[PDB]
Design a binder for this molecule. Structure first.
Ligand SMILES: [Mg+2]
Ligand SMILES: [Mg+2]
Ligand SMILES: [Mg+2]
Ligand SMILES: [Mg+2]
Ligand SMILES: [Mg+2]
Ligand SMILES: [Mg+2]
Lengths: 240, 93
RNA sequence: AACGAUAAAAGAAGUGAGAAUCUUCUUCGCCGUAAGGACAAGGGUUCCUGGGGAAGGGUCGUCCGCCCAGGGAAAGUCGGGACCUAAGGUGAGGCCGAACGGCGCAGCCGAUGGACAGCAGGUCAAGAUUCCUGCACCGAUCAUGUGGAGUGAUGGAGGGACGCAUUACGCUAUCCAAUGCCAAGCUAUGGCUAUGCUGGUUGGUACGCUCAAGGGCGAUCGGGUCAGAAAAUCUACCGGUCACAUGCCUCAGACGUAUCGGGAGCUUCCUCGGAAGCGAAGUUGGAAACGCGACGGUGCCAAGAAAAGCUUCUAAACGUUGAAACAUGAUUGCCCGUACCGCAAACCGACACAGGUGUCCGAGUGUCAAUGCACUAAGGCGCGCGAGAGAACCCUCGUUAAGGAACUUUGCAAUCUCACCCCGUAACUUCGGAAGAAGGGGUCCCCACGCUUCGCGUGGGGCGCAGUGAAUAGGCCCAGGCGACUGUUUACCAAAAUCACAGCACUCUGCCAACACGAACAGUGGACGUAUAGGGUGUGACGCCUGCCCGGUGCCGGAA
RNA sequence: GAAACGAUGACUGAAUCCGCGCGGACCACCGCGCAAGGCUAAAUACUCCCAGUGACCGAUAGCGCAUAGUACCGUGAGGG
RNA sequence: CGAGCUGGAGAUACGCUUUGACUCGGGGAUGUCCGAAUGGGGAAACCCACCUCGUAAGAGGUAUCCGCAAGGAUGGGAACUCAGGGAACUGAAACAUCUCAGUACCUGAAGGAGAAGAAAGAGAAUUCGAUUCCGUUAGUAGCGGCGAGCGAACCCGGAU
């Protein structure tokens, strides 16, 4: 427990509620976690400890740089306490090392990957995830994202060797209700158990099931949502 | 100056039977921070003050007339000079 | 018809034009985790004194929370402000907008939280950590001495910084017992005669090689450039050195001495009942916090504010003759609140309304325990109509021959059961449970004996109809529908088979994500998250499962 | 609408005297006027305030008010 | 201005008035606190600062926007004026055009008045000749689910 900014609940913006549900809590805090990890490249550090922190589902490594400063950094599946972390293109592609893709061996399974030089990590970071490399092209690398997708990425971007783990939300069965309350307000409210007024799947004497749409009028099963833009060219194989 | 501010002497009996012990009390003005007042008095009766104490007071009366009343608000003040007891004679009153 | 809860009232005496209804006395009865006490908020003078007697007071009223007049409220340290910050509010300069205006970093406002110097008594008719009395503490400003030198920021670091459950040890507040101590007297009804009865039986401060559980702890040297924007004699990291034990540092509290106060009562005057003066003892044994020691121990996951004060550290800086710091004196101390009601005739309910209101204190005896239940201290109160009568009927209770669900839509209602020991306890079961299953027994008093003590066991004895002897105090079982479960809901006719739920499934979403609020290529929420994530929809523990029909609509893809 | 001209958000984009606009699509002829700079009395409107008047009222009328936006009701806007 | 005055108040006391009070006219001086409010905070009338002038008491400045600078602006006005934005009931015996309307309401700006104004005009006479207002033309021309219904201008008279 140490050196972290305070987090405050809030499930809606300026005026009213925006992202339904979510209201419970516990008071959790925020721990600034190094993602971009460049200003520190060129300095070795050791796993002082792996603390378990919320707002993440992902162990947290408390690294210490020769500089003297500490910096929490996601903990990949494997690092024990006391090992070594080193940033900068000059780094043995091992667990915890952060080295851009250009310098990353094909078939190498890494996470914490960015999408644009800096602004921190972005892909592969949530509890146990693995984005492996496919095979450099020109300036961009082909990689496989946890959703089974293929995106070019200019190898200019660092990455962390290895895959996160923090065990696995597989046996975590949240027991009975109220565990969800240890986190977010009573989940989903069956709009089919509301009123013609309140939502599309309202009324009906008895029990319904027609039209299939979201709280508003769109459709939820198999209706595309992404639009026509840039990244679009920079992408390969959305479906599946 | 000095002679200003004070508003009148607190008659009552306690006050009076409070005088017999060299504790003089009178009605100062509502706005009249405990110091100004401490000053004024000294220089109006020539004498210092070992201690002071003051607090505000509301009013709201009438006899009749659908004219209810209205506060009148005062600020009794109570002082204590140095062993050199008494003030003028407006004490032995 | 009503006079607003069925907690009762009686007599005497007094006042008065007039009193059931005011005052005094003596009794009775009701509350006592309160119907006592202290605040908050809210209300304001409702407080105290003297008058009053229209109207208000469900009745009288000579009285009142009502009317009139006067009085009352006192703080360097208690709360708040001149200090801090949270949500949120606002916001120069910025981003947006038909107008009005919408957002927004720093900054600022903003407690309900942080921080911070006093205690013990006395006492006006009415105030009190505010006034007095005793002793104390804090800051500030000056003088004197000591000192002999730096002082050290709107900046860095350290720290303030913080959960839930359970738990060891010492202690106090507080409470209990006694042929302890002090004081007052009397006792008679049959007895006691005091080893009876009643009452009191220490609070503050200062010193004491006194006792004392518990609790806290690295310092130092150096290294490195890459860390704290910078600087550092600070902080972090690296390593060296001693960090077993321990050791220190600190003492909740007790004890002794001193001293200050208080102390049952005593005495005196009396204008009728206050006023004034004085004063004893302070033991041994037992219990004991939700507090104190302390930011104690263990365990647990859903993983538990910020900011200033504070501690150290430099920048800059004036200064190293006269510094910072200590002490001893002195002077100094601002504004606002402090009366009274405050679980209630003083606040919200149109009424002095059977309701509603946050926090704290909350005695004793008995009963495993207890903030339960019964009685009762302190204290508070008998509820602002009263008296008779003793019919029908209505409400709230007690008992009821014989029968025992025959009642009836339904055993609705009302009984039975009813606590704590011991013995005993089915199907079925996710092996937890079903269980307090079901059923049976005990339970008081005396004495001896032994036990771990309050208490209890063993044996004998005793009394009643009866011994959790009075109050609190499960009726039980078989079988089926629905829903798995705890939970949630129609404030004022529906609590449920409703909703939610853990679990499952489809699908959308590549991250300025899908999606949603919005005048807006602003801002923001999703998320300071990133696909084992987030959105949407349906299903709803667990178990065995879940088929056939894509003509039609939709959704995806193809696409001449 | 056959519908001109004025106007403007969006794209465009001219001339200048043997020049430019219009005279209700459109053309010629005929005709009236010169746009893309500006300031300007006066007659016009209303009525908080003032005076005068009234085949206006004279107290359930007249203003809500012989005065009060008070009492009283509402958390408030507000009503009164 | 000349006997009275001492406010409504109907009261008592004290008093003031020809070196003409009082009252009426007309200029000055004072004018706490809040309020655009503007030193900073603020749940209005309260709470806290600072700099300067200084006997201290006490005085004054301390807001944002335009401008060297004077100096101007922020606020408030019953209705009237223009402008930006702009309903619905209702009619049409229903209703979507259309009507009700560009009215009601919101907002901005302004004054005592505004707005408009000195012609790339209207008109058919080769006429008038800034704007505005009243009369008339006329309910004519025309607009219109050519339905409901809406409704000009020139000329001419007059204010100026
Ligand atoms: Mg009776
Ligand atoms: Mg069945
Ligand atoms: Mg259920
Ligand atoms: Mg339930
Ligand atoms: Mg009459
Ligand atoms: Mg009036």
């Amino acid at each position: 427990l140490t050196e972290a900014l305070p987090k405050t609940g809030g499930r809606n913006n300026r005026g009213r509620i925006t992202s339904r549900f979510i209201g419970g809590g516990h008071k959790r805090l925020y721990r600034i976690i190094d993602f971009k990890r460049r200003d520190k490249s060129g300095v070795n550090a050791k796993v002082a400890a792996i603390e378990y922190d919320p707002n993440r589902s992902a162990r947290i490594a408390l690294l210490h740089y020769a500089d003297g400063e500490k910096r929490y950094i996601l903990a990949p599946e494997g690092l024990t306490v006391g090992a070594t972390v080193n940033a900068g293109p000059e780094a043995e592609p091992k667990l915890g090392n952060a080295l851009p893709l250009r310098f990353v061996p094909v078939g190498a399974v890494v996470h914490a990957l960015e999408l644009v030089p800096g602004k921190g990590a972005q892909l592969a970071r949530s509890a146990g995830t693995s984005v492996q490399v496919q095979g450099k092209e020109s300036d961009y690398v082909i990689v496989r994202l946890p959703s089974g997708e293929l995106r070019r990425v200019h190898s200019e971007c660092y990455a962390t060797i290895g895959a996160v783990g923090n065990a696995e939300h597989k046996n975590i069965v949240l027991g009975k209700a109220g565990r969800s309350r240890w986190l977010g307000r009573k989940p989903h409210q069956r709009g089919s158990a509301m009123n013609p007024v309140d939502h599309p799947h309202g009324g009906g004497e008895g029990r319904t099931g027609a039209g299939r749409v979201p709280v508003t009028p769109w459709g939820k099963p198999t209706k595309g949502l992404k639009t026509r833009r840039k990244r679009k060219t920079s992408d390969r194989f959305i479906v599946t | 100056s000095h002679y200003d501010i004070l508003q009148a002497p607190v008659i009552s009996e306690k006050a009076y039977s409070a005088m017999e012990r060299g504790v003089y009390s009178f009605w100062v003005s509502p706005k009249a921070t405990k110091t100004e007042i401490k000053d004024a008095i000294q220089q109006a009766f020539g004498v210092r003050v070992i201690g002071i104490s003051t607090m505000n007071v509301p009013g709201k009366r009438k006899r009749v007339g659908r004219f209810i009343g209205q506060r009148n608000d005062r600020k009794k003040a109570i002082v204590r000079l140095a062993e050199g007891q008494s003030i003028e004679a407006l004490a032995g009153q």
